[PDB]
Design a binder for this molecule. Structure first.
Ligand SMILES: [Mg+2]
Ligand SMILES: [Mg+2]
Ligand SMILES: [Mg+2]
Ligand SMILES: [Mg+2]
Ligand SMILES: [Mg+2]
Ligand SMILES: [Mg+2]
Ligand SMILES: [Mg+2]
Ligand SMILES: [Mg+2]
Ligand SMILES: [Mg+2]
Ligand SMILES: [Mg+2]
Ligand SMILES: [Mg+2]
Ligand SMILES: [Mg+2]
Ligand SMILES: [Mg+2]
Ligand SMILES: [Mg+2]
Ligand SMILES: [Mg+2]
Ligand SMILES: [Mg+2]
Ligand SMILES: [Mg+2]
Ligand SMILES: [Mg+2]
Ligand SMILES: [Mg+2]
Ligand SMILES: [Mg+2]
Ligand SMILES: [Mg+2]
Ligand SMILES: [Mg+2]
Ligand SMILES: [Mg+2]
Ligand SMILES: [Mg+2]
Ligand SMILES: [Mg+2]
Ligand SMILES: [Mg+2]
Ligand SMILES: [Mg+2]
Ligand SMILES: [Mg+2]
Ligand SMILES: [Mg+2]
Ligand SMILES: [Mg+2]
Ligand SMILES: [Mg+2]
Ligand SMILES: [Mg+2]
Ligand SMILES: [Mg+2]
Ligand SMILES: [Mg+2]
Ligand SMILES: [Mg+2]
Ligand SMILES: [Mg+2]
Ligand SMILES: [Mg+2]
Ligand SMILES: [Mg+2]
Ligand SMILES: [Mg+2]
Ligand SMILES: [Mg+2]
Ligand SMILES: [Mg+2]
Ligand SMILES: [Mg+2]
Ligand SMILES: [Mg+2]
Ligand SMILES: [Mg+2]
Ligand SMILES: [Zn+2]
Lengths: 209, 37, 175, 141, 58
RNA sequence: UGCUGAAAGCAUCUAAGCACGAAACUUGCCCCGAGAUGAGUUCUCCCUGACCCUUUAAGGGUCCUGAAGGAACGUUGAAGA
RNA sequence: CGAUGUCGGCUCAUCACAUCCUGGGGCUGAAGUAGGUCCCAAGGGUAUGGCUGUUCGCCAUUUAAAGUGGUACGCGAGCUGGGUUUAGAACGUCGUGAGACAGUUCGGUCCCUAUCUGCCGUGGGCGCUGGAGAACUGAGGGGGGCUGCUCCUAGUACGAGA
RNA sequence: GUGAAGAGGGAAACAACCCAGACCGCCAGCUAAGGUCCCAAAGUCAUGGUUAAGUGGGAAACGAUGUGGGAAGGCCCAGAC
């Protein structure tokens, strides 16, 4: 359904009447606003493109500011797009309120990951390391052997080795929402949503619950 | 449900038929007679 | 062959529509359509369709008896009536009808809540005896078999869902 | 010294053909030799003498027998557990352009000029296109 | 050389095994090089040639 | 396992056709994904000067023009060899 | 033979299906339970220890299961060197002796920075035919799929009981 | 007998198999072994039958109302099934 865009600020815990310590996190969600409505005859697919946040005047560029003043909105910071289905009526000037999640029990959260650098073979793909003793020389952490002999006589495609760790788009699903905030524009969702704090995540109703 | 490459009739009600490239042997009142080629 | 040369009969009182293949026979029960394959020539003698192979085919007598038997079955379904009556067996096995629903308590934690096609008018004159009517014989045979064959009756006790007129194999657990 | 038809002087055409009711093996070799360009008298091997065809409604092409289902399409990708397979009826219901494009890709020759001759295969599977501005002629086969 | 000869033969409406047979009926000794070279430019004389083959057969 | 039913007037899941069927199949879940050369779709912002020379026009050069926007440099980061 | 390092462990796999588990159907000398036996099915999963140099094997103990094979009986320009294998020493036995013996204990140097194919990552130039700032449609690809047990139905059906 | 001491077209490639024995030059004609739907040159050439299984384009013991042709017999309007 119509997603929204938030920014993860911290992690805290909501307690209960009983004594449950529910882990929870606060994604601040301002009121997003429709920027470009598409459909099939206009572009090829029904969707919605939006933007929330704030960007400075002397670093919004002349291509972007024309698209801003073509709508009539403020100087936001991103450009995100949500696919849709039928049975909806929409315009461009109306801004989306923060209470669209106020009746959904299970949501989905996508975002970026953290950046763990050029990783290792014992670190990313969980290769069990070898003997740190007992004769063994200079092969404590290497990934060992990778191919057969002479038939194929090559390293197959789909192999796993060292590389960049994460730092891409990941997805956690079906999470638990406990509380909204009309006063200071928050969403409290149970768990540990991806990415470091100071990043912007894409939240939506859960695709299968 | 035998599988054999030498099928046969046994009783007086064995009906050899051919379905979908398979020479089946069946019977009206016998579960053991039921076959396949 | 021999049923391909022995032709059909058809009485009056009925809206005959032989538009070549689409022979819709609108009368007392209903009407059936079928777009036959074209390996048969057929004309109406106002009481009897002739049946034979159209000239040039290889397996011409394939359709020549089957389409004849089907055109017997369609017009006698429109004329008289068709069912093949079932009989539920078993204590704790009960069947209830409201027009186009079957509710069976066929030994499962969820009851068999099953639905019906267009050409089915079903009735239970007794709680375990159901009969489902219709005219299209090929459809009301298959629908009866699907509505029955959740449980073939097991060869020891005879407890299950069987036809009212079939044959079951009484078995013997030896000691 | 026999004449070698230089490319900047030789022309091109525009034909359309509605392949409904036509068989694959007896259609595709004619669409292969048309864009190979040998039915014209001024054919040369090493320089392209091709044509332009447009094959309309290519989701109707039929092969007789039982081979609407018994015609397989094997292709392997490069990741060791990844060779796949789709059959003829599924390829027809999914993408009815590649049922003709690979059929002419077989019979057309293989190389840089093979891909150059493939570049003119403007083959569709609908009942309209956007090169009628080029005023084509309805060829019959 | 035989390629453009067969091209012009299918262009005018005749095969190759009938064409060379009609020209052997007309007892010509002209080779594939110049039989192709006529069909390069002079289309009406090669049309006359296949008309002669059609008038030798028919 | 079926329904209808000839070949073979009868039984026949099969030859015409119609219905069911499992972690395998295509999807459905998710990721990098137009260097898809078959190179895309898509709403936006900028340049509306004079000329002579043989390359007679898709050509070479002198001058006000040098904007959209990016690169480089400094402060650096939950981005990083 | 102007040399392709050999058994077994450690580390990484991939395919095969004559399928160990799990999925669906027929037969039974199948009441239920659990099984017998072939037929379809290879997506996924497959024990930690004692003992010898050991794959196996035996034994102790789990689990749904502890599959069968090829890949130079996969893999030493990736790693142990215990096994068989060099030089020393001894016992049995053989020869008069020099010394031998799939007989045995004991100690015994495992070299190399990647040029190229390959594979996982990160990048500059140019093309996409006016040039630049972005957001995307997705033909194809790639990871993913496991299973235990307790409770409801119900101590129902089946069964003489159990 | 090729092949070692031998080139070339057909068997995809392929010393030994079939064709065949090239001293040099030519943008000349006829065929062999083998091929003529396009890749790659030449018949989607005509009558004419089998095949329905990609059989053609890998195999046995045995199996069967798959199928075409021939030769005899028994039962039959004393209607044989
Ligand atoms: Mg980082
Ligand atoms: Mg370890
Ligand atoms: Mg060392
Ligand atoms: Mg160390
Ligand atoms: Mg079947
Ligand atoms: Mg696979
Ligand atoms: Mg080639
Ligand atoms: Mg029958
Ligand atoms: Mg039947
Ligand atoms: Mg599962
Ligand atoms: Mg599924
Ligand atoms: Mg050497
Ligand atoms: Mg050696
Ligand atoms: Mg098997
Ligand atoms: Mg069994
Ligand atoms: Mg698999
Ligand atoms: Mg496996
Ligand atoms: Mg799957
Ligand atoms: Mg151990
Ligand atoms: Mg020990
Ligand atoms: Mg062991
Ligand atoms: Mg081996
Ligand atoms: Mg071996
Ligand atoms: Mg092994
Ligand atoms: Mg080895
Ligand atoms: Mg090695
Ligand atoms: Mg080793
Ligand atoms: Mg040692
Ligand atoms: Mg280097
Ligand atoms: Mg390198
Ligand atoms: Mg780049
Ligand atoms: Mg897939
Ligand atoms: Mg000799
Ligand atoms: Mg010699
Ligand atoms: Mg030779
Ligand atoms: Mg040769
Ligand atoms: Mg060979
Ligand atoms: Mg060759
Ligand atoms: Mg000579
Ligand atoms: Mg010959
Ligand atoms: Mg040709
Ligand atoms: Mg012919
Ligand atoms: Mg055989
Ligand atoms: Mg009798
Ligand atoms: Zn029997």
């Amino acid at each position: 359904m119509i997603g929204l865009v938030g920014k993860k600020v911290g992690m805290t815990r909501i307690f209960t009447e009983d004594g449950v310590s529910i882990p929870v996190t606060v994604i601040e969600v301002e009121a997003n606003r429709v920027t470009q409505v598409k459909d099939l005859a206009n572009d090829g697919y029904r969707a919605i493109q939006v933007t929330t946040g704030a960007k400075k005047a002397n670093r919004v560029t002349k291509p972007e500011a024309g698209h801003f003043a073509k709508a009539g909105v403020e100087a936001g910071r991103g450009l995100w797009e949500f696919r849709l289905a039928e049975g909806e009526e929409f315009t461009v000037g109306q801004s989306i309120s923060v209470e669209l999640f106020a009746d959904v029990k299970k949501v989905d959260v996508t975002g970026t990951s953290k950046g763990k650098g050029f990783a290792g073979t014992v670190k990313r793909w969980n290769f069990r390391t070898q003997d740190a003793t007992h004769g063994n020389s200079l092969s404590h952490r290497v990934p060992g052997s990778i191919g057969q002999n002479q038939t194929p006589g090559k390293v197959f495609k789909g192999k796993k080795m060292a590389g960049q760790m994460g730092n891409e788009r990941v997805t956690v699903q079906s999470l638990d929402v406990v509380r909204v905030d009309a006063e200071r524009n928050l969403l409290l969702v149970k768990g540990a949503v991806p990415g470091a704090t100071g990043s912007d995540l894409i939240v939506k109703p859960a695709v299968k619950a | 449900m035998k599988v054999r490459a030498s099928v046969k009739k046994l009783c007086r009600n064995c009906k050899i038929v051919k379905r979908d490239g398979v020479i089946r042997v069946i019977c009206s009142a016998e579960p053991k007679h039921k076959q396949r080629q | 062959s021999r049923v391909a040369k022995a032709p059909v009969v058809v009485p009056a009182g009925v809206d005959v529509k032989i538009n070549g293949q689409v022979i819709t026979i609108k009368g007392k029960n209903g009407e059936l359509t079928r777009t036959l394959n074209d390996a048969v020539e057929v004309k109406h003698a106002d009481n009897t369709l002739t049946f034979g192979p159209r000239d040039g085919y290889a397996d011409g007598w394939a359709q020549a008896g089957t389409a004849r038997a089907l055109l017997n079955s369609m017009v006698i379904g429109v004329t008289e009536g068709f069912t093949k009556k079932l009989q539920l067996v078993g204590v704790g096995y009960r069947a209830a009808v409201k027009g186009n629903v079957i509710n069976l308590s066929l030994g499962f934690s969820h009851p068999v809540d099953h639905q019906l096609p267009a050409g089915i008018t079903a009735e239970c004159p007794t709680q375990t005896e159901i009969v489902l009517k219709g005219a299209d014989k090929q459809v009301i045979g298959q629908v009866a078999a699907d509505l029955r064959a959740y449980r073939r009756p097991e060869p020891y006790k005879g407890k299950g869902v069987r036809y009212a007129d079939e044959v079951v194999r009484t078995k013997e657990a030896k000691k | 010294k026999t004449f070698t038809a230089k490319p900047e002087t030789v022309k091109r055409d525009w034909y359309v053909v509605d392949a409904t009711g036509k068989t694959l093996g007896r259609l595709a070799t004619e669409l292969a030799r048309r864009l190979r360009g040998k039915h014209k008298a001024e054919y040369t091997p090493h320089v392209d003498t091709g044509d332009y065809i447009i094959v309309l409604n290519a989701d109707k092409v039929a092969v007789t027998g039982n081979k609407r289902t018994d015609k397989v399409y094997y292709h392997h990708t490069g990741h060791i557990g990844g060779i796949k397979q789709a059959t003829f009826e599924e390829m027809i219901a999914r993408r009815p352009e590649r049922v003709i494009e690979i059929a002419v890709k077989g019979m057309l020759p293989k190389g840089p000029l093979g891909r150059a001759m493939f570049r003119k295969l403007k083959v569709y599977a609908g009942n309209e296109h956007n090169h009628a501005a080029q005023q084509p002629q309805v060829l019959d086969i | 050389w035989i390629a453009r000869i067969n091209a012009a033969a299918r262009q005018n409406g005749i095969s190759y095994s009938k064409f060379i047979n009609g020209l052997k009926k007309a007892s010509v000794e002209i080779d594939r090089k110049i039989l192709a070279d006529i069909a390069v430019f002079d289309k009406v004389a090669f049309t006359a040639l296949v008309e002669k083959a059609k008038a030798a057969l028919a």
